[PDB]
Structure formats: structure tokens, C-alpha cells
């Protein structure tokens with residue numbers, strides 16, 4: 459499609475700019491592996507990067523859909539939102555999606571790591587970062603649909619980046635995805651707002667619900683949500699008004715914030731602007 463090739467042209471990367479280390483796999487998704495790479499910016503310097511292969515995709519139509527949906531990310535720019543470096547086009551072999559390198563990986567493993575032992579304050583700071591990244595996306599009217607600790611990365615300066623959207627979205631670990639929902643597709647049902655499970659629709663408000671689960675993940679340092687609720691039962695569980703319990707080391711006012719995030723009435727849940735304020739307030743008390 460022309461329109462699409464137009465926009466991709468904006469972010470095209472010439473192969474001689476890009477070195478991929480195919481011996482260096484940093485993740486496997488349904489579309490293909492992600493590799494270590496190094497990119498050369500025009501005015502000099504080596505940029506370490508993550509290179510996503512789309513070689514698994516067979517249908518050209520699947521690729522058009524994917525670029526189409528994902529390309530708008532090039533318009534985003536915010537220190538708490540993952541950026542697109544560019545797209546490399548080639549002869550044999552699919553386009554490579556070029557993304558920033560995240561030295562410290564995903565937030566969930568980072569905080570589960572026992573030698574890291576992040577403090578409650580560190581944990582709340584990470585949460586505040588994610589809040590600010592979501593505030594930006596909502597203002598662009600972009601709905602994430604899969605916010606969670608496993609989908610936020612940390613760079614070498616320990617800046618948190620909301621990720622796994624757009625050209626970076628793929629199934630990377632299916633443990634916490636389930637087809638037991640109305641669409642029949644693998645969805646993150648234990649992060650989904652009640653109404654999305656019922657109506658199959660996603661909004662910024664259900665992003666807020668997910669951010670609420672993400673917070674609980676931080677304060678438990680990466681414990682799995684609802685470990686004793688079957689994926690068959692998560693809707694009924696929530697209808698009954700039951701919710702994730704307060705973590706041992708979660709401050710009380712932060713648990714309030716979580717609970718506001720899981721209000722059954724979608725419009726009764728705070729905005730990310732609200733969240734950034736409230737959570738910022740709580741962070742300062744530390």
C-alpha cells in the first residue's frame with residue numbers, strides 16, 4: 459500500500475547503518491526473534507539497539523495490517539514511552555523493526571530479582587514513571603490494551619518505558635495470556651477491566667484498571683495476580699466485587715488508589731492525570 463510506504467519512508471534505516479547479531483537473541487515473539495544490534499546515527503555514533511524480525515509472518519496482508527496499526531508510534535515522543543528508532547528494508551527477508559536497547563530489561567523481572575531488592579520508595583517511583591507515560595498516551599488518545607509490569611522496560615539510566623505497543627507488540631510469553639474469553643484469542647484476562655471482558659471493548663479507562671493491577675505488581679515485587687482464581691472465573695470473581703488484596707508493604711493510601719482503579723463504573727475511575735498527581739503526592743511523603 460502506498461500511503462503506508464510513504465510513512466515508513468519517514469523512518470527508514472539503510473542496511474549499512476545496521477548490524478544485527480543473530481547469535482544474540484533477547485526475545486522470541488510470534489512474528490520472529492528480537493536480536494541485539496548496533497545502529498549508526500548519521501552524525502557519528504554507535505547506538506546499541508533491539509532488532510525485531512518479522513520473518514515469521516507469511517501473509518503480506520498480515521504485514522500491512524501490522525505496519526498500518528503500528529506506524530503511528532513514530533509520532534509519539536516522551537521519556538516514559540518506548541520510541542521507534544526506525545525500520546530497515548531489505549531484499550530477501552522481511553522489514554526489521556528497530557527499537558531502543560533496554561539494558562535492564564522488563565520491570566517485572568527487575569523487581570523480582572532478589573539482589574536488586576528495590577525499596578517501597580523505588581517501587582512507587584517506577585509506578586509514577588509508568589503513570590506519566592500513560593498520561594502522555596491518553597492525551598494522544600492512544601489505548602494500550604496490554605499494560606502490565608512485563609511490558610514496561612528499563613533503560614541504562616533506570617528510566618521506565620511503557621512498551622509492547624505498536625510495532626513492538628507481540629506475544630512474547632504466553633503464561634499470563636488466556637483464550638478463555640469472548641474473543642477466543644489469547645488475552646491478558648487478569649489485567650483486563652471487568653467491562654472489557656463483558657463487552658470486548660478497550661478504552662483508556664480500562665487501561666486505568668490495568669495500571670491498577672500494575673501497581674499491585676510493583677508493591678508485591680512481581681507476584682502473579684489472582685493465583686487462585688481460574689481463568690474461567692475472573693469475570694464472576696470481579697462481578698462479585700472481589701479485588702486483589704492489599705500487599706504487605708503497600709502503603710494504605712496507595713491501596714486506595716488501586717481500589718479507585720478497579721471501580722466497576724468505568725467513569726468513576728481516575729484519569730492518568732489524577733493518578734500522576736496522587737501518586738506523585740504519595741511519593742514525596744517518602
Ligand SMILES: Cc1[nH]c(/C=C2\C(=O)Nc3ccc(S(=O)(=O)Cc4c(Cl)cccc4Cl)cc32)c(C)c1C(=O)N1CCC[C@H]1CN1CCCC1
Nearest residue numbers: 485492508557558559560561562563564609621622626630
Ligand atoms: C537486555 C534485555 N533487553 C530486553 C528487552 C528489550 C530491549 O532491550 N529493547 C526493547 C524494546 C521493546 C521491548 S517491548 O516490551 O516492546 C517487546 C518485548 C521484546 Cl522486544 C522482548 C521481550 C519482551 C517484550 Cl514484552 C523490549 C525491549 C530484555 C527483556 C533484556 C534481558 O533479557 N535482560 C536485562 C536484565 C537482565 C536480562 C534478563 N534476561 C533473562 C534471560 C536472559 C537475560
